[model samples]
Target: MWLGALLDTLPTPALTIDRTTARRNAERMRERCRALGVRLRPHVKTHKTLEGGLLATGGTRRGIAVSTLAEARFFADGGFDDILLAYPVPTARLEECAGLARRLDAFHVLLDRPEALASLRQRPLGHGKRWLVWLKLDCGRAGVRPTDPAALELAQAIANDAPEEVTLVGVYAHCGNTYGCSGADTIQAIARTTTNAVLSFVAALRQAGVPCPQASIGSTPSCSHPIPEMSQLTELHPGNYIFYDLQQTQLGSCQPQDVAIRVLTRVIGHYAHRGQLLVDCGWAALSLHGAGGPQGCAAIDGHPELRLVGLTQEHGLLEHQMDFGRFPVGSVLALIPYHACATAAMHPVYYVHEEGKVVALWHPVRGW
Candidate 1:
């Protein structure tokens, strides 16, 4: 399973994606969804690569979720037909949304507040194009949470009073609370409670004479955990599980082995006085995580000797009291990132690898 000889030629500070490992994860999640009898529309925000998104859906052409309308358009142009704009789209992008909708079979967007819904109602896309609207249910998070009353009321408004072009498809919930949990059991509990909340909303909608069928639920941590209760959901959209990072590891969503991507860097200088290993990879290379959090121990397989204790635009400061017997100024090291999504955006292309060598190059399609 050795990758081709391309690895020796590429420079350090590059992203390496193991396609074989990614495909294994994709297939495993797909099988999990199938066994649960739920539709799995993988979130593309994790890898943000056509190669990874396509693999996440088990090679299905139309199965994927995008974090932005730009990502939706990118995949749509690349021959994907069904896409869900998972975020609450801004009112300013209505024109782009309508234009994109005209070209695709299915394009779903999120609406969490009545004002957002009202804005859409006022400026309906008048081209007679119908849409499947997934009412955003907050399911009790901190501030962004939406009440079930608002969800049902909005659905009823869309169902009974909106123009023929608008269709109330179902309710979608992102139990983002799972990310705040510290263990697998808490994550699973959050998943179950979130799913039950969405189900209850659906029941409320039905009781209020609103015909609702679809139920979408998501959260990277909980979705990655074993939660049979989420079988109640019709569609599961978990984006970050594709490439778990240090944050996810801290939250107990994935193991070190589950992380299939890494940034290759080189230690160019060491400041004996300040106890810093000045690595070539920095905010521009590995991407910056603002409001800096603690970095977990580096993965043992690739570069156990080097730990990214702290980083800036041009330097990575090593721990003052740690051992660095295996590290040197010219050593090439592979470091796991704090956040994969931010890290993925910092790199324009992925140096795909297998068995510790490069196999292919994948260019990331970029947009809003």
Candidate 2:
């Protein structure tokens, strides 16, 4: 490690979470949501650990969003009752959905099309519980487009026709297009557009005699720099902000220092002839999401000259002009990930550290 904090006991190619930094990130998001007059229905898909989920929900352990039924069940089992399966439910997972809806006081699902709606109607919850549904508004990507008739039609149908089977709890939208933004201004612009679209649709629903109790729009980029008008939204579901990554920095969603996740790898080989240092981490540890970066697949902590030139299944080639000496054969290196969500999913256990000292092992729930 840069500060000689790489203990010998810790294994190489391990995923490390900065506990203080992550908790700060979570607290900051909660503060931002509080200021925006929006409830923080934080997404746990970025780091599926119970500690992470509890932090994201501001210790309430309530109102979390997940991208899969598996996550919904995981959080529900962990005592998180207010849950939203933000992704559309697959036809095959109806039984799992019913289980959550029946067990939890609040379990939500998002539906963008009639087929998904139809699937829910066919299998109603058994315990006098109805599937809490959100009619997804396609602000930029996924969901039903705002202008499409189905947006209002589905809202009306869910509000009117499915009283016994389903309840339209909210109108949700994911501003995923903000990923293409380069700065806070652009991210805020997408947030404005998405919030407007969702709010406008909610207005239409109300005008059509349909009650929309809640409205939510989120993606890390959009929610990270929300506009004042976004205060009109009832809820926000930001996942990746809890572990800001290199991509979040490039997109201006967060600064380089805000990243809370890193991959710790050890130098195993030094090819003096080629002036390269080989690390015990590659696609399996860091993945290839940021493989195309000119500097490398990931940002080497405290080292700007190093470039991850290439990656094998279990090896990383750190190339520089005769830089092997700087990183000796046994030295540890930390890599700032490109995408926290994608990177976190690769590791089964996260070594949570505070000031370079490992304090806990967080086991992330996996599978979808």
Model 2, total clashes: 0
Candidate 2 Cα outliers beyond 4 Å, as residue runs: 1-9, 292-296
* TM, every model: 0.90, 0.95
Q: Evaluated with TM-score, which candidate comes out highest?
A: 2
- Tens digits of per-residue lDDT, candidate 1, 230-329, equal 7877889887787777778778878888877788777777776766676777667666662344345233235455456666775565544544555677
For model 2, residues 1-368, the per-residue Cα lDDT tens digits are 22334433478798888889899999999999989888989988888988899889888999989888778878888899889888876778787788788888998888888888888888978678887898888875578887888778888888778798888998988888888778888888888888888888888888889988999888899877778888888989988899999889889888877999999899999888888888898888878886554354688889877878888889888876675557667888888878888878889888887866777777888888
Candidate 2 clashing pairs, residues 3+ apart or interchain:
none
lDDT of each: 0.74, 0.84
TM-score of 1: 0.90
Estimate the lDDT of model 1: 0.74
- The local lDDT score (0 to 100) that residue 126 gets in candidate 1 is 67
